[PDB]
Paper text:
The structural observation suggests that Ile34 may not be a major contributor to the affinity of DNA binding by TALE repeats, consistent with the classification of NI as a “weak” TALE code. In total, we obtained nine high-quality structures that elucidate the accommodation of base A by Leu, Met, Cys, Pro, Trp, His, Thr, Asn, and Glu at the 34th position. These residues may all represent weak code, if they are used for base recognition.
Transcription activator-like (TAL) effectors specifically bind to double stranded (ds) DNA through a central domain of tandem repeats. The crystal structures of TAL effector (TALE) proteins bound to their respective target DNAs have revealed that the residue at position 13 is the only one directly involved in DNA base recognition, whereas the 12th residue stabilizes the proper loop conformation. dHax3, an engineered TALE protein, proved to be a useful scaffold for structural characterizations. We then present fifteen crystal structures of engineered dHax3 variants in complex with target DNA molecules, which elucidate the structural basis for the recognition of bases adenine (A) and guanine (G) by reported or uncharacterized TALE codes.
Residue numbers in the entry: 231 to 721
DNA sequence: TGTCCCTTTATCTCTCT
DNA sequence: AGAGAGATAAAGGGACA
């Protein structure tokens, strides 16, 4: 027999029951736990399904799936029920914070290390709990917390970094690695190649920070002199997500992409300066000619699509969907290029293809409106949220379709829509804001927190802001959102 | 294996002027 | 409003007891 067969049966036997109360997963959630948490994790969720759900912890079935779907999930589940009260009463953290900490590989380690080092890290090191929680909310949070305790002094004193910078570096997977590598390489990178600490913090403050630092050190000379890249251009590549892989891939494919396709170095850097840059570059090398065939998408359009995170996914999805969307949906190549030219372009194109019919026929939008919603980062989310919420917003809340589309046509459009639908009645009914004003506020990136800031001030007012009228607060929130209100508060 | 740690890639959301 | 920045997730590999 295949030996993993008994272990697969256990999974299903137990998985079956979990669809019932008090959790009741939906296969998606169940599949997820199995893949990452594995068999012992699916069994642990079952075993502790009652202890977690209701009193005393009262975790939503959502948070339970978040804690369980990682390596050592079972251990995290046992530790949360043991340490969530300790952490929520002895340190003043919220359950949301405890869950965020639990929800990573080795979460048991992170929760225990937080319980053990938070006092020392706030008292003797002057860190907030927020910062402690942030450091702890990544795989190996335990290692990062311990490395922060050990190296905060030398990093601020001998090397001149602020605590904020140290926290920023530590708050990624492999935090301990990035920290140790910054200690050794900060003088080397600053004094030998003339980088500022700030640039060095930016290179270190991503997952694989250690790898990006050492790769900058190694390849900077070769990049700046052989290829004519500026130091500034190298940093941009190393600090934007491609990291080590994008750097190594720039050295390889800069000449190839320039000579053979007439791309400028400026355009190549922009493709590389994203998450999965390596992947975007190699995909462009392969795909540019296929896309710009028979007068197809121009080079410039191909670069534009490529120059976003997951740009590889975007390029491939265009090649697949450019014909079907242009023909069977009546979209100009220009419109398809628009929707694909953002982070998650693949997701948006796919969602346009799926919902463009439904949004026009069932909700009476134009293609141009569906394109506008989709043509932002997270466009898939904005599209799905418009489909769900268009009726309750228009019918129950009074908004026009044009207004609902307006709120949706920005990064975070989904957050902006859910938050409007949530807070419109108290904003209008309880504090006298007009709908048009609420729509104005939420029709910008950062729509959600701007609206939350406003409601927070109208319901537990700060004297710091009381000299301002409702109309002023609105004018301010449209101008600069939560940041503009936070600033004014500090004055 | 189960658990812990690290690295790359993709997606989503908010900031900054 | 595009560019910059940063949180969160999925998925794979090393390591080890």
């Amino acid at each position: 027999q295949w030996s993993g067969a008994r272990a697969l049966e256990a999974l299903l036997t137990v998985a079956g029951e979990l669809r019932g109360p008090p959790l009741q997963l939906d296969t998606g959630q169940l599949l997820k736990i199995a893949k990452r948490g594995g068999v012992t994790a699916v069994e642990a969720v079952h075993a502790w399904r009652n202890a977690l759900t209701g009193a005393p912890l009262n975790l939503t079935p959502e948070q339970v799936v978040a804690i369980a779907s990682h390596d050592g999930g079972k251990q995290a589940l046992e530790t949360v029920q043991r340490l969530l009260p300790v952490l929520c009463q002895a340190h003043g953290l919220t359950p949301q914070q405890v869950v965020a900490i639990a929800s990573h590989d080795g979460g048991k380690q992170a929760l225990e290390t937080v319980q053990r080092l938070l006092p020392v890290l706030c008292q003797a090191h002057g860190l907030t709990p927020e910062q402690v929680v942030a450091i702890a909310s990544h795989d190996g949070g335990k290692q990062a917390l311990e490395t922060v305790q050990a190296l905060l002094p030398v990093l601020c004193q001998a090397h001149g970094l602020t605590p904020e910078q140290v926290v920023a570096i530590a708050s990624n997977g492999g935090g301990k690695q990035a920290l140790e590598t910054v200690q050794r390489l900060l003088p080397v990178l600053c004094q030998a190649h003339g980088l500022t600490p700030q640039q060095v913090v930016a290179i270190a403050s991503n997952g694989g920070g250690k790898q990006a630092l050492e790769t900058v050190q190694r390849l900077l000379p070769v990049l700046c002199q052989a290829h004519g890249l500026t130091p500034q251009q190298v940093v941009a590549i190393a600090s934007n997500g491609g990291g080590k892989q994008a750097l190594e891939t720039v050295q390889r494919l800069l000449p190839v992409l320039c000579q053979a396709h007439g791309l400028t170095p400026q355009q190549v850097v922009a493709i590389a300066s994203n998450w999965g840059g390596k992947q975007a570059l190699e995909t462009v090398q392969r795909l540019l000619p296929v896309l710009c065939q028979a007068h197809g998408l121009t080079p410039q359009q191909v670069v534009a699509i490529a120059s976003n995170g997951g740009g590889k996914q975007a390029l491939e999805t265009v090649q697949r969907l450019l014909p079907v969307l242009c023909q069977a949906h009546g979209l100009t190549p220009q419109q398809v290029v628009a929707i694909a030219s953002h982070d998650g372009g693949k997701q948006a194109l796919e969602t346009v293809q799926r919902l463009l019919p439904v949004l026009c026929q069932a909700h009476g939008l134009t293609p141009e409106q569906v394109v506008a919603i989709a043509s932002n980062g997270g466009g898939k989310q904005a599209l799905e949220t418009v489909q769900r919420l268009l009726p309750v917003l228009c019918q129950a809340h009074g908004l026009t379709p044009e207004q609902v589309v307006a709120i949706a046509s920005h990064d975070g459009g989904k957050q902006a829509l859910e938050t409007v639908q949530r807070l419109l009645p108290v904003l209008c009914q309880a504090h006298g804001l007009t709908p048009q004003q609420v729509v104005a506020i939420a029709s910008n990136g950062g729509g959600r927190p701007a609206l939350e800031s406003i409601v927070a001030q109208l319901s537990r007012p700060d004297p710091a802001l009381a000299a301002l009228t409702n109309d002023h607060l609105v004018a301010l929130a449209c101008l600069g959102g939560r940041p503009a209100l936070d600033a004014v508060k500090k004055l």
